[PDB]
Amino acid sequence: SDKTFLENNQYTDEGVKVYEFIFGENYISSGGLEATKKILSDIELNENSKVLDIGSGLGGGCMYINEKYGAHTHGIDICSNIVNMANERVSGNNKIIFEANDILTKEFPENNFDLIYSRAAILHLSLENKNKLFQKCYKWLKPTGTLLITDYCATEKENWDDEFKEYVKQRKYTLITVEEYADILTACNFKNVVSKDLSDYWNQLLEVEHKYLHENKEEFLKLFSEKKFISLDDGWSRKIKDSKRKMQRWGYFKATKN
Numbered sequence: 536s537d538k539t540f541l542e543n544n545q546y547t548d549e550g551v552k553v554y555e556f557i558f559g560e561n562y563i564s565s566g567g568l569e570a571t572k573k574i575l576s577d578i579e580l581n582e583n584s585k586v587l588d589i590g591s592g593l594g595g596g597c598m599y600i601n602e603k604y605g606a607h608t609h610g611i612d613i614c615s616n617i618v619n620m621a622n623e624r625v626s627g628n629n630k631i632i633f634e635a636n637d638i639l640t641k642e643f644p645e646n647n648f649d650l651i652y653s654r655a656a657i658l659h660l661s662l663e664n665k666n667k668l669f670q671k672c673y674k675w676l677k678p679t680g681t682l683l684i685t686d687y688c689a690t691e692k693e694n695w696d697d698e699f700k701e702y703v704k705q706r707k708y709t710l711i712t713v714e715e716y717a718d719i720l721t722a723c724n725f726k727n728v729v730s731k732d733l734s735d736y737w738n739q740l741l742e743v744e745h746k747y748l749h750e751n752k753e754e755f756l757k758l759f760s761e762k763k764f765i766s767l768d769d770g771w772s773r774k775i776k777d778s779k780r781k782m783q784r785w786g787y788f789k790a791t792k793n
């Protein structure tokens with residue numbers, strides 16, 4: 536249902552390929568590899584670490600984490616077609632696993648992971664399900680483990696304008712404030728909760744991506760259609776405008792179990 540909605544609309548094969556063109560090979564979220572390097576710059580792991588990636592997409596994050604640290608990485612994604620694409624991009628590596636499943640019904644042992652990592656995925660979850668997920672994450676982390684998240688956030692709903700309301704409604708996102716998000720983590724008894732509103736950084740990423748799209752329009756049109764170009768172009772224009780005024784926000788969260 537949730538699964539069917541995502542597979543048949545935002546994350547159709549063609550939809551993901553369009554996103555990948557602008558985000559970067561193996562990525563479906565902003566900044567691609569370069570942002571991932573920054574997000575993980577203060578994370579310490581090694582070959583004995585176990586990592587969970589919630590909403591693993593095309594697998595770029597898992598590929599990088601395994602490359603940088605040698606860690607065991609397990610990616611969960613609800614879209615079967617996306618997981619199929621991810622599995623075609625990795626071979627001969629028994630420390631990278633991609634699995635098609637709803638994270639809300641997936642079972643993991645308590646005290647299992649050194650790092651639980653998620654990039655631009657939890658926006659798809661209802662508010663009730665965000666709280667349920669972070670309770671599960673708390674159990675699944677080792678005592679010494681870390682939670683690391685980036686996600687779409689927003690200003691308070693009361694402040695949304697007509698265009699943003701419509702965007703959120705059609706995407707079926709649940710966008711909360713950075714502050715409400717941090718409060719959920721605190722309510723789940725995570726420790727050392729750090730939240731950052733990185734909307735300015737995100738704005739910079741979006742501008743680079745927008746410039747890339749325009750400068751490679753001929754290549755894009757060979758691959759796709761002008762209709763899809765216009766949708767992407769207008770989509771990024773709106774996100775640049777709405778991130779600048781913090782109507783749509785980009786949140787970073789890090790916390791520990793103890």
Ligand SMILES: Nc1ncnc2c1ncn2[C@@H]1O[C@H](CSCC[C@H](N)C(=O)O)[C@@H](O)[C@H]1O
Nearest residue numbers: 562563564590592612613614637638654656
């Ligand atoms: N309930 C759920 N369980 C697992 N994955 C989910 C989910 N709801 C949404 N997703 C996944 O979240 C992903 C968002 S796209 C982001 C992919 C990757 N983290 C990257 O940054 O590139 C989608 O692939 C979608 O399938």
Ligand SMILES: C[N+](C)(C)CCOP(=O)(O)O
Nearest residue numbers: 563564565655656706770
């Ligand atoms: C949400 N996402 C960052 C995974 C994909 C892009 O979504 P959108 O920016 O087109 O709404």
